[PDB]
């Protein structure tokens, strides 16, 4: 009824704030991005440093894996995204078109497409093979904080400081739904559930909300943590028990029971804001990453 996550490894090497961490879909690797303009790769199970991937001209806010674990895409303050071959380190494409910082990115499950969100308030859809922008969505009226495809890639959910979550038809580019609560504080994060039926969104009033997408209604609420300033990544954890996992501006990793909404664990170790968390695809393993005063990534493991 409660996980028992404990610190196993601390990964040091970035020289500025870390911005995101993501496990490869094959579960072998962890990728990290940082304000230091670098991508680093680490062993997912032992935290062993693997390689540094370089090329962006300014800091990086987000990284994401292709479904076959062979490619990465990164989103940078230099207004570009880059597509990387992880094994060779080669930059395969530079995606140009956004007119301001690119803040978030993702492959679709098929991995023929990339979605990106920007401080220029647009969501763009890119062709992986050619690097060309296929669609530009007038998505929001403030910076876009997160973008994510659903399980079959037919849908995109986006979030923004404008207080909205919007769901988009990938093929047509049409806005299918706008999620509106009793209030609209800045939405700093959003992502689909594994089955794509639900949407987890974070707002800058210290609140995570779980939405039923089809019914367009908020069902569960998760609080107790601190989140008023930063775009902190959260997760469904489904390898053991069903949990919600999130970073927090009090330097802790928070873990909630998905159903009861109670806090079940709080992980201590970081010395600055935990900006990012990731859940391993098959094992009960959490990766967490922290901002400038800390700069380390931590790997935690649990029996459930």
């Amino acid at each position: 009824v409660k996980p028992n996550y404990a610190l196993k490894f601390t990964l040091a090497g970035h020289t500025k704030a870390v911005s995101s961490v993501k496990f490869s879909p094959n579960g072998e690797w962890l990728a990290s991005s940082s304000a230091d303009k670098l991508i680093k790769i680490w062993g997912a199970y032992d935290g062993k440093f693997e390689k540094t991937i370089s090329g962006h001209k300014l800091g990086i806010s987000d990284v994401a894996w292709s479904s076959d674990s062979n490619l990465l895409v990164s989103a940078s303050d230099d207004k570009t995204l880059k597509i990387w071959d992880v094994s060779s380190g080669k930059c395969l494409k530079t995606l140009k078109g956004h007119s301001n910082y690119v803040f978030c990115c993702n492959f679709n499950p098929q991995s023929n497409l990339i979605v990106s969100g920007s401080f220029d308030e647009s969501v763009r859809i890119w062709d992986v093979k050619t690097g060309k922008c296929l669609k530009t969505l007038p998505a929001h009226s403030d910076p876009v904080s997160a973008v994510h495809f659903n399980r079959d890639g037919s849908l995109i959910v986006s979030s923004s400081y404008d207080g909205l979550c919007r769901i988009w038809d990938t093929a047509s580019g049409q806005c299918l739904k706008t999620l509106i609560d009793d209030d609209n504080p800045p939405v700093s994060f959003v992502k689909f559930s594994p089955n794509g039926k639900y949407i987890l969104a974070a707002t800058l009033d210290n609140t995570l909300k779980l939405w039923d997408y089809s019914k367009g209604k908020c069902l569960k609420t998760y609080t107790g943590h601190k989140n008023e300033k930063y775009c902190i990544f959260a997760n469904f954890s489904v390898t053991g028990g069903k949990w919600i996992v999130s970073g927090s501006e009090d330097n802790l990793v928070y873990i909630w029971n998905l159903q009861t909404k109670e806090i079940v664990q709080k992980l201590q170790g970081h010395t600055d804001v935990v900006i990012s968390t990731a859940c391993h695809p098959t094992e009960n393993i959490i990766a967490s990453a922290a901002l400038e005063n800390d700069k380390t990534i931590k790997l935690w493991k649990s029996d459930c």
Binding site: R151, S193, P194, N195, G196, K197, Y198, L210, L219, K220, F236, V238, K242, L258, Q259
Partner: peptide, 8 residues
């Protein structure tokens, strides 16, 4: 009331 975020 018990949500299932995994089954498709």
């Amino acid at each position: 009331e018990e949500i299932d975020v995994v089954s498709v």
